[PDB]
Design a protein around this ligand. Sequence first.
Ligand SMILES: CC(C)=CCC/C(C)=C\CC/C(C)=C\COP(=O)(O)OP(=O)(O)O
Ligand SMILES: [Mg+2]
Ligand SMILES: [Mg+2]
Length: 471
Amino acid sequence: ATAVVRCRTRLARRVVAAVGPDGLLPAPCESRVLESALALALLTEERAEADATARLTAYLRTTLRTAPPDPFQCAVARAVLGRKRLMFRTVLAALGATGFPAVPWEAYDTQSWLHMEMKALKVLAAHGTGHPDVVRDEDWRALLPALEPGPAWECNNLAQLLALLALRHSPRHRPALGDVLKHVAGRLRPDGGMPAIDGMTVFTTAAAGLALSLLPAPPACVTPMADALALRRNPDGGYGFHSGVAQSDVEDTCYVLEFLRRAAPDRHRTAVAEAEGYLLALRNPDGGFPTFARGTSSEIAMTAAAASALAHDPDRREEVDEAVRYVVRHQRPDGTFERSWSRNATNAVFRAVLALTGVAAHGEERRSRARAAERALAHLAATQNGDGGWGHAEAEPSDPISTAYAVIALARGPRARPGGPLDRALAYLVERQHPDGGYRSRPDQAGPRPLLYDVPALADVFVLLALAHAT
Ligand SMILES: CC(C)=CCC/C(C)=C\CC/C(C)=C\COP(=O)(O)OP(=O)(O)O
Ligand SMILES: [Mg+2]
Ligand SMILES: [Mg+2]
């Protein structure tokens, strides 16, 4: 057929091959400078795990020299080798690089993940400013999961590392420190670094399952993939980003729900209904959806994702319509929406356009939604790079993941024409395919925002999702 279909075919073979017999696509996270630096600081202060601290030191020096991250992580690394503003400043102050914020202690009180990180930073600031008496027993109590053996609580190495840097100041918690330092030291990757998270296999398996389910003839492996996801659902009916993550989130749950609706709607009928229930219980009064917890602010990409995921059930048409109306209201004067968990402009455009064009609509609302979708697709056309791709921002060089999101959106516009934006984007993706069938991309996932972390398995998965939508 076409060079695009040949590309799609080679990539689908690669993704299918990567799925294991347990139904999961492995999705390890690369080493990250922030967690590596905090681990070095911790092990160094405790005079522990000499072999690991030397590997961490060499990892940080190499990375700073060859592939330096953002300026904040660079400053963290240099400090150890030699609300977000509150958190990041307090991290640097704990490492001796700047002064502690002169804020009331209540400034630190607040994710269950963010809550633990901010309590740990509160303790570090109390001790660092010479006021250890300020720390209350409820502050220490929040940190107790960091003393449990095994992988980090919620697969979150930042939260455990900060908690342990705080807890090593408390005499009544130190008996438990030795054992957990051994398992922290045991997490180093082959390059000597500490990954941000244990992995992202639930998110990655769900997105890949969805992409495979959009192919003309989905592979047999979608069934064990669907099985592997459904048996990992949390009690509230939602999904976390990796095995062992108790805090469900809207983004993971929408990808799982979208996948199960296509590949296993009867086999996994109860998980499907529980995932819809999870989303509906989170819905905010304004018709939007938060990321984790009701009462926190609606977000555009989460609202669009939930609109599309719920649209399958005609019984939910009223909540879907209110979510799409929310998307229309929040479009910016230049046709864009607003980032978040992705650091590129194209992620929220792709979610918004799918919501604006999937939910069938007629009359005035059809015209309102069509105008919004056109402005967003026009923003993509206006910002497309000369090589046919998109970057993280309008003046950034193209990358396959940012381009994949734009392709998914453009596949909802008018048909590709020779030399048009969608045609040129697909040619860009065809040209970036590696001999082994895969894609390498700058990562787009952030957390804590805006700090990037790198799960390389996602590049293949999102490019396949784009090619499955566009063909
Ligand atoms: C599934 C995925 C694509 C959605 C992104 C959110 C997801 C559930 C994981 C984020 C990664 C996290 C473990 C690192 C800290 O992020 P953080 O949540 O603490 O970041 P924040 O402080 O800015 O809120
Ligand atoms: Mg956080
Ligand atoms: Mg975190």
